Amino acid sequence: QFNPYGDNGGTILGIAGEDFAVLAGDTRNITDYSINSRYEPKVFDCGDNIVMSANGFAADGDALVKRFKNSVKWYHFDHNDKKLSINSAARNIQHLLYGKRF
Amino acid sequence: GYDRALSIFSPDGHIFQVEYALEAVKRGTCAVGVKGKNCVVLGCERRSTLKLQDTRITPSKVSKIDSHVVLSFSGLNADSRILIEKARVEAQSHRLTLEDPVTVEYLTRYVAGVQQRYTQSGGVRPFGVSTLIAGFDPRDDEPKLYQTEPSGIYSSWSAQTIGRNSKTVREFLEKNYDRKEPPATVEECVKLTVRSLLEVVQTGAKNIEITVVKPDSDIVALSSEEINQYVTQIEQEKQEQ
Amino acid sequence: NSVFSPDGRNFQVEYAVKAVENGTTSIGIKCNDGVVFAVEKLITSKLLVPQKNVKIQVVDRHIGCVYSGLIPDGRHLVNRGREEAASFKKLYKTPIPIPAFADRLGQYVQAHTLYNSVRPFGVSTIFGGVDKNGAHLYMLEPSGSYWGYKGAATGKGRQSAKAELEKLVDHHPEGLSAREAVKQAAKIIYLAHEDNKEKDFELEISWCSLSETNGLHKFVKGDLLQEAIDFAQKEIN
Amino acid sequence: MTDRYSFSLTTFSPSGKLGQIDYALTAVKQGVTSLGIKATNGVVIATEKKSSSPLAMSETLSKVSLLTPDIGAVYSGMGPDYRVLVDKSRKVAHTSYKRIYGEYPPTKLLVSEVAKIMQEATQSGGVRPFGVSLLIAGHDEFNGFSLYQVDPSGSYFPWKATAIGKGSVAAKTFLEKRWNDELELEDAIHIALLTLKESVEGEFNGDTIELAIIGDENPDLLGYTGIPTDKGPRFRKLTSQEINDRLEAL
Amino acid sequence: AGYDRHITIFSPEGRLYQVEYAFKATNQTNINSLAVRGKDCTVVISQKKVPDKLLDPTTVSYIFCISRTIGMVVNGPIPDARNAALRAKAEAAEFRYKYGYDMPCDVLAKRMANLSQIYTQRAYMRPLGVILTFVSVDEELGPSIYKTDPAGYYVGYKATATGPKQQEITTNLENHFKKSKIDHINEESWEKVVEFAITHMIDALGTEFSKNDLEVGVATKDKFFTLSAENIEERLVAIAEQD
Amino acid sequence: MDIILGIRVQDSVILASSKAVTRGISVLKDSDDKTRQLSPHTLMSFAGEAGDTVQFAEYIQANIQLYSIREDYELSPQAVSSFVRQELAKSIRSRRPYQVNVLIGGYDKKKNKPELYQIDYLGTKVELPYGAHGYSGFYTFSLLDHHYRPDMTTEEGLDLLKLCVQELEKRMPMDFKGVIVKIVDKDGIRQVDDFQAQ
Amino acid sequence: FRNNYDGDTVTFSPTGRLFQVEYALEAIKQGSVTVGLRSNTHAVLVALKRNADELSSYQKKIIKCDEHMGLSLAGLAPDARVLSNYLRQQCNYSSLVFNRKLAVERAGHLLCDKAQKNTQSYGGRPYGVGLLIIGYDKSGAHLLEFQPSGNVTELYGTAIGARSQGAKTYLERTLDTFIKIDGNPDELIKAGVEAISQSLRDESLTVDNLSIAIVGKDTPFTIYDGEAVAKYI
Amino acid sequence: TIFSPEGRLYQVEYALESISHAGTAIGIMASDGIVLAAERKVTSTLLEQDTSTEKLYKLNDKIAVAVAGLTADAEILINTARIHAQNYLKTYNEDIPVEILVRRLSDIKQGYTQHGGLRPFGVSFIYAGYDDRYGYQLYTSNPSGNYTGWKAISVGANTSAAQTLLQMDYKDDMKVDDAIELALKTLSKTTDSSALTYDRLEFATIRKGANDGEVYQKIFKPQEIKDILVKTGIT
Amino acid sequence: DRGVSTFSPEGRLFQVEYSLEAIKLGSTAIGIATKEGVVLGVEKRATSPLLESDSIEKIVEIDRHIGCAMSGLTADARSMIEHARTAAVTHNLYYDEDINVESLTQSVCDLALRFGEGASGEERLMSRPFGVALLIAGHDADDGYQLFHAEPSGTFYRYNAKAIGSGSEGAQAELLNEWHSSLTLKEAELLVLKILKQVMEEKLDENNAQLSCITKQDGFKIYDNEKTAELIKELKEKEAAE
C-alpha cells in the first residue's frame, strides 16, 4: 500500500539565553541508508525575529514552515503590521498542527 | 430557493413590514401582565365573531414554555404557535446542556432573537406577534415580566399590556401601579389585573381569563367563577358617588 | 432578455449591439495562408504608456481574438474561450479547429440571450486562425450569430472599414498575402479612424500565417509594424 | 443560468379568483372538442383529428393515448402540454405503483397522480398551469369501468358521459338526452360518433376521427401465450377502417 | 409592460405571446424551405441568401447533419438554430449509447418538441425562435419528415414547407399530390426527387435559381448528405432541358 | 458485567441498578445512579458503553419532557417505550450506534397498571413481569421464575430483589458496590435509599 | 429612455448603456482625491485622506497588497477592502504555488475580470470604487488605474476622485520631468505631492491630511503617515 | 405572504375569499357522535355520484375532514395528514390525538404564510374525530393556519346564514340523529338550488358503533343519504 | 423601488442611506476618548414609566478591554455583539493575546457587508443592512485608548469624540468646542453627562442615562446608578458657581 510518510533524518537544537536564543540543526537530508543532500538547510528565519525548524518528514516540515510564514504575513495584514510575539507564534503553531490531528 | 428581500428600509428609515406587523398586534385581542411582590399575573380577552364554540379543546392564550415560565401574546395566533414551539425546544435544550432551567430573561432574549432574525432574512415576513413572558428564575423568588415585539426588541416591565386598546389600559396602569407598594399579595394583584382589563372587554364573561405564577414552578389558572368574584366585588364597590 | 419583442426580435440583444456600435473599430482580414487582426486604440491621455495596453488576445497558441464594445465583456469571452480550448485539447489531444472554436463561443454567447437573469454580451468579437485545413476568419455578434468572413469589421468605423474590405476582396480574387494584409489592415484602421477622430489613436496588429508564423498567433512588432504604419500614413497624404 | 422565478405565478386576486387557472380554462375552451361515454361493459373516448394542411399525417398525431394496458387518455386544449402529461403519467404509473405492487394502478389513483402533477404546476415557482383538460377512461378489477375529467386546477371528477372543448356546451346537452345506464359498448360508440358529428366543420371520416375503447381483454394484442391469467389489454384504438363501417350505418 | 407579454404565462384569452413572437422570429431570415419524400429517399430544399460580399459563402448554412441518418433544416435565426442543432446531436448520440440502435427521426422530433414545450411552460426560459424540419429514411418507417415549432408541436408530413412564403409552397405541393393520387415522388433516383423539389420551389416562388441560391440535403438508407454547388448545378442544368 | 434489574409487582414496578462505575483497574464511583426520570410516572434504567449510556438517557428524557410541556399531558409507559425502541432501531443501522441497554418501568394512570419494558441496544422490546440486562440475567431469571408471584405487594417485591442482589453478590465475579432501588407506582417515583445496609 | 433601464446591471438601455455601472462610477467622482505616478525606478501613491469631523480620522486610503505591490482607493472603502483582499490572495497564490511574484499587469487583468462578473450577474452590484495600483516587478515600475466598470489601463501617472482633472492636467504637462526622476525617491514623492495640489479648493495639505506610499528597485511597498510625511508639506 | 399597511395578509384574505364561493360544509358535534355534511357545487345529471368523492375524506380510522375550497390543494394536505397520523402510530403504537394532527396541518398552512413566496392553500377543513383524551372533537382550519374548536360550525358558501341557523337550533344535549337532521335543515335553507336532492350531498358520521365500546366511521352511501332525506320531510 | 443594493444616480446605496435615517431616529450615544480612558454614555429613553429602566442594555461588554454603545434599531445589534465577542475570544484562542480594537471593529464591519438577496460573493446571508450604529471603545498596548464609529455601510471612523442618535447634530457641535487633548477621565464623564442633558427630549437623572468607561488597569466597567447620580449632584454644583 502507499505510505504517505517518510523519515529524512536530521537533528535540531534550541537553546535560550538571557537576551538571545539559538536554533541549530544539521544540514544532512537522508532516505533510509542514502544521503539526498549534504547541504539542505532546515532552520528558517520566518520574519518578526522568529526562527523555526520542523524536523522529521521533510515534506511535512516544509509545508508547516510555509504556512507559518504565510500566517505571519496575514497577521501583519489583518492586525495593522503588529509584531507577532513568540508566545503568539507558539499558539498559532499549535492550531496549525492540531488542524491536522487526524 | 426563494430569498427576495421583504423587510427593507423606506426613505424615512422605517422598515414597513415590521411596522405593519405591529398593526397586526394592535389588531389582536388584549393581554396584560402585572408583577406583584411574590407573583406575576397574566390576563387576556376573547373576541366575538361567533359563540357556538367548544372551549375544552381551543388553545388558551397563556402557554407553558417550561414548568416555571409562561408566554402570552397579542397578534396572529398562527405565528404565535411557531414562536411557542421554538421557545419550548430551547428550554429543553438549555436543561440538557447547562443542567439548569432557563432564566426568564434568557428565554425572552431567545424569543426576541427569533423575531429579530425574521426581520432580516430573504423571503420571510416578520411575526405579527408581540409577547409577554413571565415567571421565576430557578431557585429564585423575585418576579419576572418581559415583553418582546416583532422588531426583536425586549425589556422588563413592572406591568405592561399589548394588543387592541392597550393604549387605554397602559394609561390605567400608569396611574394605578405604585412602584413602592408592588401589589403585596396574590389577591390584590389579580385585583389590579382585572380592573385594568374591564374597560376594554365589556362584560368577565367567556372572554376574561387569568393565570397566576408563583415561585418554584407553581402555575395555576383561574375558573370563570373565581374571576366573577373579582368582577362582582369591583363593579358594585367602585361605583359610589 | 428572455424576452422577444412583438416583431420577433430580442430587444436586450438589440441594445447590446448599440454598445458595440459605440466602440473602437477593429478588423479581421483573411489571406491565402492565414488571418490578420487589427484594432484602433484611442489615446485618452498622453499618460497612457504606449504599446502597454494590449487589446488583442491569444487563445491556445493558434487563435487570435479582437473585439469592439465593452472591453471587460470581451475579456470574459476569451477566458471562456481558453477553457473551451483546453477542454478540447485535453480530451481530443489535437489543438482545437477554428470552426469548432467558433461554435463554442457561439453557444456560450447565445446562452446569455436565453434567460432574463443574464444580460447579453456588449461585444462583437473577431477571431480566427490556421488549423489542420486552412485559415479561417470569424465574426460573432452579441446575439450569438457568427459566420465565416473574407474580411470583417465592427465598431464606430465599421461602414467605412467594410467598404474598404469589399474593395480588396473584389480587386484580389486570387487572394491576398499575409505581408500585404498586415499593411492593408493598417490602412483600413487609419481610413476607420475618420469616424472617431476627436481623440488620437494607437494601431495594434496581430497575425496567424502558416508560412510567416508557423500557424501560431503572433504580434506584429518592430520593423514590420513600423512598415505598416508608414504604408498607412503614405496613403492618406 | 439558474431559475430566478421561485414564486408562484398563479396567485389569488382580490375577488378570490386564481387568474392563471381561469386563463388555462379559456385555452381549453378553444381546444378541439373531445368526449367520453361510459357503457355497462366499456368506455369510449373520442376526439377530432383537426389537420393543418392535408400534407400533415394525422395518424402520426396521437390524440388518444394509452396510459396503461387498461387506461387511456384524450384531451382538449394545448397538444404539447398533453403530450408531456402523458409521458409523466405513464412513468408515474410505474414509479408510484407497478414497481411497488406488481400491478398497474386502478383508474382513480392514476387520475389522482395526474391531478397531482397538474396541481403542482398551479403552485410551484416559475410555472404556468397546464392548458389542457383530460378525459381519462379506465377499468380495474375492483372498480370496473370509470371516466374522469381533470382540469388545469388539478380538480378531477367522475362522469357517466361528458365532453370538453369548443362544442362542449352543445354536446353535454346532446349526451344528457342520449345517456341511460343500460348502454352496450357498440351503442356508446354510435352515440359518440353522433355527438362528434355536431362539433366538425369539414370532412367527417375515419381519418379525421380518433376513437378509443376500454372493453374486454384482447389476447391477440398481448404478444405472447402460455400464462392463462392475463388475457391482454382492455385498451383498443379503433382503426380508420372500423370507424367508417359504423359511419355507413349511422 | 404587461407580464403576460414578457414571460410565458397565459393572457386573459389563454394565449402565450412569447410563443407567438417566437413564431414571428422564425421568418426573420427571409428563407423558404421545403421537404419531400421519394420512394427510398427524402429531400430538403432551402433558399440560400448571401447578401454581404464579405461573408465566406461556404460557412452560411441552415441545413444540419444530426446523425449518420438524420438531417435537419432550421427556419429562424442562426444562434437559436445552432443551439437546437448542438442539442439534437447530443440527444442522438446519447440515445444510441443507451438503447443500442440509432435514434429514429420521429423520436428525435418528439424529444426536441418536448424540450421546446418546457420553455413554453417555465418562466426563466425563452422559447427558441425556430422551426426544425427533421428528415431521414427510417429503418422502420421509410422516408420521413417530422417538423417541430416553438409551441412544442410536432407532426409527420407527406411533404412540407416553411418560411415567409410557406402558404404558397404548401398549396402548390398539395395540388401536385391531389393530382398524382399518391403521397410521395414516384422516382427511383434521388437526383430526380431533388429536381422535382427545385421545380416546385421555382413555380411557387416565381423565381429562377442559380447554383448559389439553394441548399440541398438528401437522406438515403443508412446516409444523410448535403449537396455541393456543383451537384446542384447539374440538377439545375437537367431541369432547364425540359421545363 | 453492570447490573440493571426490574421487577413488576401488582401495584408497582421496582428498578434496581448497580452503583459501581469502573474504568479499567479502578472503581471510580460507588454511588452512581443508573437512571433518568422520563415523566412523573416513567423511569428508565440503563447500562452499556461508557459514553453513550448517559447521552442516550438524557436525550430520551429531554424528548419526553419536551412532549409533556407541548401537550400538558403524560405519555403512557407503552408510548414512551415505543419511542425509545424506535430510537434504538434507527440507531443500530447508523454510522456509530448507541450501545445502550434499557429497562423502562412506569405506572399507567389510565389503565391503573404497572408496566416493565426490556429493550436492548438493537431495539428489541418486550413487556415482562421481571427483567435484566447483561450477565445478571443468567442468575436472576431462574431465581424469579421460582419465587415470583404476579399478585405480590411492593414490600414482597423488595424481598425478591434482596434475594436477587444476594445471589449476585455471591456468584458474580465483579464487585458492583450494591444497588440503588426505586419504586414507580400510582403516586410516582421514590428512592428506597437504605437498601445496602438494610 | 432613462426610465425603466437603470433597475439592475442585468439591463442595457436603448442607447446601449449600463446605468447601474455608470452610477457606480459616480461614487468615485464624489470621493477624495488620490494621485499616482512613476519613473523607471519607483512608483508613488499620494492620497489625500478625508475626515468626517475635526475630532475624527483622516480615514486610510492606501492598502498594501504584497512586498512589491499595493493600491490607493476612491469611492466605497469596503469595496476597496474586498478587491485588495482578493489581490492579496492572488499575489499570495503566485508566491506559494510558483515562487513567482505576481506581475502588476496580471493583477490588473484579475481585478478587471472580478469587476466584470458584477456587471453581468443579477442581484449583484458593480463595485463602487476606483483604484490606483503601483508595483515593482520583473519588468520595472508600473501604475494602473482600475475602474469598477472593469476597465484597467496602464499609465505613467494619473489621478482619481474629486477635482482629479486638475492633477491629471498638471501630470500631463509635467510628464518628461517626473518620468526621469530615477534613483531619487524624494523628488518623485515631491512631484506627486505637487500634483495633488492642483485639486484643492479645500486648503495646504496637513500632517494628518496626507498619506504617501512608494515601491521601487530596492524598496518594498511602504506607507508613510503623519510624522514621516511632514517633510513633504 | 406580505403584510398590508393595516396588518393583514393579502393572499390569506383572498384565499378565504376564494373559499367563500365553495360548496358549504357543516360540522355538528353531539353527546354521542359527530355529523359531517357537505354540498356539491352546481352539478349535472351525468356526473357520476357513485364512485365519487370530493368533499369528505377519511384521515385515519378515528378522524375525517370536510373540505371547502380547491379539491386538488386539499388532496395534497389530506395525503400528508394521512402520513403524519401513520408516523405518529408507528412511533408510539397509539393513534394520533385529534388536536395534534390538526395542529400539524395548521402549521403547514401557516408556513405558506410566512416564507417561501408560494401561494397559500385555498382550503378550509372541518375536522371530526375521536380520541381517548377529549372524546369527540370538531375543529376548523383555514389558509391563515388558524385553528379553533366547535360545537357546530360551517365553512364555504353562506356561513353567515348557516351560523345563525345552527346557533338557533343547536343544544348541548343533542343525540347524533338530531344533529344529522339539523345538518340537513341548515343546508336546505342556506343551497343555491331549487331543492336539496341526494346526489348533491356527501354525509358522514363518527359514532360509538351501537354495541362494542368502539368507534365507527360511516361515509353515507348515495342510497343512505336518499333515505335520511325522506324521514326528515324533504323527500 | 427596484432592488436592495442598487445605486442612486448620485452613486450611493439606497438601502444604506435609509439605514442611516433609522439611526437618526435612535437614542443618543456619546463617546469621549482621553488618555486616562474612554467614556461611553447613552440615553436610556423609556417609552413608559413602567419600563424597568436598568433592563435597557445599550452599553455592552465585548471583551475586558473593549466596550460598545449602540443607537438605532437596537435589536439588530444583538448579532453584531455576538460576532464581536466571538471574534475577540477566538483571537485570544489562536494568538494568546488581546485583539486590537481596530481589528475587532474591522471584523464587525465585515459582518455589516454581508447583506443582499443572494449577492455574488464567494455569499451574502442577510436581506438588508443593519439599522444600528455602534461606538466601539477600548484600549490596547499598541495604539492606546480608542473610539470607533461603525456604520451599517461597513465603513468605520476613528474619533476623539463622537455622538450618534437623535441629538447627534447638537451634541457633535458641543463636542467640537469642549474636546482637547488633556481631558481627564473625570472631566470626560462630566462632559458626557452635560452634553446628554442638553439633547435629551427628559430631565437627566441616573435612571434614564447610563455611563461606562474603559481603563487599561480595570477594563470595561458599567457605572451603577449611585455612582452616576453622584456625578450628575456634582455637575449641577460645578455649573452653579459658573
Short mmCIF file of N, CA, C and O in Angstrom, two decimals, chain E residues 123-160:
data_model
loop_
_atom_site.label_atom_id
_atom_site.label_comp_id
_atom_site.label_asym_id
_atom_site.label_seq_id
_atom_site.Cartn_x
_atom_site.Cartn_y
_atom_site.Cartn_z
N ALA E 123 -40.76 29.91 -16.75
CA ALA E 123 -40.68 31.37 -16.89
C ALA E 123 -39.30 31.92 -17.24
O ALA E 123 -39.20 32.90 -17.96
N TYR E 124 -38.24 31.30 -16.72
CA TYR E 124 -36.88 31.80 -16.93
C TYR E 124 -36.31 31.46 -18.31
O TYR E 124 -35.33 32.06 -18.74
N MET E 125 -36.92 30.49 -18.99
CA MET E 125 -36.52 30.09 -20.34
C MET E 125 -37.37 30.82 -21.37
O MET E 125 -38.62 30.77 -21.31
N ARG E 126 -36.72 31.46 -22.34
CA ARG E 126 -37.44 31.94 -23.53
C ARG E 126 -37.54 30.82 -24.57
O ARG E 126 -36.62 30.01 -24.67
N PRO E 127 -38.66 30.74 -25.31
CA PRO E 127 -38.71 29.77 -26.41
C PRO E 127 -37.59 30.03 -27.42
O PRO E 127 -37.02 31.13 -27.42
N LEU E 128 -37.25 29.04 -28.23
CA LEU E 128 -36.32 29.28 -29.34
C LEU E 128 -37.12 29.70 -30.58
O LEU E 128 -38.14 29.10 -30.91
N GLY E 129 -36.66 30.75 -31.25
CA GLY E 129 -37.37 31.27 -32.41
C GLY E 129 -37.10 30.47 -33.67
O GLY E 129 -36.65 31.03 -34.66
N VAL E 130 -37.38 29.17 -33.64
CA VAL E 130 -37.04 28.30 -34.76
C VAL E 130 -38.10 27.23 -35.07
O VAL E 130 -38.84 26.79 -34.18
N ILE E 131 -38.17 26.84 -36.33
CA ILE E 131 -38.91 25.65 -36.75
C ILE E 131 -37.90 24.65 -37.32
O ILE E 131 -37.12 24.97 -38.21
N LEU E 132 -37.90 23.45 -36.75
CA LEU E 132 -36.93 22.43 -37.12
C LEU E 132 -37.63 21.36 -37.95
O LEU E 132 -38.65 20.80 -37.54
N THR E 133 -37.08 21.11 -39.14
CA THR E 133 -37.57 20.07 -40.03
C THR E 133 -36.56 18.93 -39.98
O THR E 133 -35.38 19.14 -40.27
N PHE E 134 -37.02 17.74 -39.57
CA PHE E 134 -36.15 16.57 -39.49
C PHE E 134 -36.46 15.60 -40.61
O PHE E 134 -37.62 15.32 -40.89
N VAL E 135 -35.41 15.07 -41.25
CA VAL E 135 -35.58 14.16 -42.38
C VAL E 135 -34.63 12.97 -42.32
O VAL E 135 -33.47 13.11 -41.92
N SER E 136 -35.14 11.81 -42.71
CA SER E 136 -34.35 10.58 -42.76
C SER E 136 -35.07 9.50 -43.56
O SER E 136 -36.24 9.66 -43.93
N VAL E 137 -34.37 8.41 -43.84
CA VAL E 137 -35.03 7.19 -44.28
C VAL E 137 -35.00 6.26 -43.08
O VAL E 137 -34.01 5.56 -42.84
N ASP E 138 -36.07 6.28 -42.30
CA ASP E 138 -36.12 5.49 -41.08
C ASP E 138 -36.08 4.01 -41.40
O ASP E 138 -36.68 3.56 -42.38
N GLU E 139 -35.39 3.24 -40.56
CA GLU E 139 -35.23 1.82 -40.81
C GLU E 139 -36.54 1.05 -40.63
O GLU E 139 -36.68 -0.07 -41.11
N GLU E 140 -37.50 1.66 -39.94
CA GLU E 140 -38.81 1.05 -39.77
C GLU E 140 -39.89 1.72 -40.61
O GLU E 140 -40.76 1.03 -41.16
N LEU E 141 -39.83 3.05 -40.70
CA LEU E 141 -40.89 3.84 -41.33
C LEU E 141 -40.61 4.30 -42.76
O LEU E 141 -41.51 4.75 -43.46
N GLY E 142 -39.36 4.17 -43.21
CA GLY E 142 -39.00 4.63 -44.55
C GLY E 142 -38.82 6.15 -44.60
O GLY E 142 -38.59 6.78 -43.57
N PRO E 143 -38.92 6.74 -45.81
CA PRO E 143 -38.76 8.18 -45.90
C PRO E 143 -39.66 8.90 -44.90
O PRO E 143 -40.86 8.61 -44.83
N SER E 144 -39.07 9.81 -44.14
CA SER E 144 -39.76 10.51 -43.05
C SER E 144 -39.43 11.99 -42.98
O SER E 144 -38.27 12.40 -43.19
N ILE E 145 -40.46 12.78 -42.68
CA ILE E 145 -40.33 14.21 -42.42
C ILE E 145 -41.10 14.50 -41.15
O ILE E 145 -42.29 14.22 -41.07
N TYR E 146 -40.43 15.06 -40.15
CA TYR E 146 -41.10 15.46 -38.90
C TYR E 146 -40.67 16.88 -38.56
O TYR E 146 -39.48 17.22 -38.64
N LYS E 147 -41.64 17.71 -38.19
CA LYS E 147 -41.40 19.15 -38.05
C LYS E 147 -41.91 19.69 -36.72
O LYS E 147 -43.06 19.45 -36.35
N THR E 148 -41.04 20.42 -36.02
CA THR E 148 -41.36 20.98 -34.70
C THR E 148 -41.35 22.51 -34.72
O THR E 148 -40.66 23.11 -35.54
N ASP E 149 -42.10 23.12 -33.81
CA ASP E 149 -42.19 24.58 -33.71
C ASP E 149 -42.07 25.07 -32.26
O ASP E 149 -42.04 24.26 -31.35
N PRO E 150 -42.02 26.40 -32.04
CA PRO E 150 -41.79 26.94 -30.70
C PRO E 150 -42.90 26.68 -29.67
O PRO E 150 -42.76 27.06 -28.50
N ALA E 151 -43.99 26.06 -30.09
CA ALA E 151 -45.10 25.79 -29.19
C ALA E 151 -44.95 24.43 -28.53
O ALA E 151 -45.60 24.14 -27.52
N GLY E 152 -44.07 23.60 -29.11
CA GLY E 152 -43.86 22.23 -28.67
C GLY E 152 -44.66 21.27 -29.53
O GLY E 152 -44.82 20.09 -29.18
N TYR E 153 -45.18 21.77 -30.64
CA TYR E 153 -45.98 20.96 -31.56
C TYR E 153 -45.06 20.22 -32.53
O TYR E 153 -44.01 20.74 -32.91
N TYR E 154 -45.45 19.02 -32.91
CA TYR E 154 -44.73 18.32 -33.97
C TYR E 154 -45.62 17.30 -34.63
O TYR E 154 -46.45 16.67 -33.97
N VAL E 155 -45.45 17.13 -35.94
CA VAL E 155 -46.21 16.13 -36.67
C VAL E 155 -45.40 15.61 -37.86
O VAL E 155 -44.41 16.22 -38.27
N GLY E 156 -45.80 14.45 -38.37
CA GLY E 156 -45.20 13.90 -39.58
C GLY E 156 -45.84 14.52 -40.80
O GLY E 156 -47.00 14.96 -40.75
N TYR E 157 -45.09 14.55 -41.90
CA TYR E 157 -45.58 15.13 -43.15
C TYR E 157 -45.39 14.20 -44.33
O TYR E 157 -44.42 13.43 -44.36
N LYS E 158 -46.32 14.28 -45.28
CA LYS E 158 -46.11 13.73 -46.63
C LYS E 158 -45.06 14.59 -47.30
O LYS E 158 -44.04 14.10 -47.78
N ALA E 159 -45.31 15.90 -47.29
CA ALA E 159 -44.35 16.92 -47.66
C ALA E 159 -44.62 18.14 -46.78
O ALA E 159 -45.63 18.17 -46.06
N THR E 160 -43.75 19.14 -46.83
CA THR E 160 -43.99 20.36 -46.06
C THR E 160 -43.18 21.55 -46.58
O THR E 160 -42.29 21.39 -47.41
#
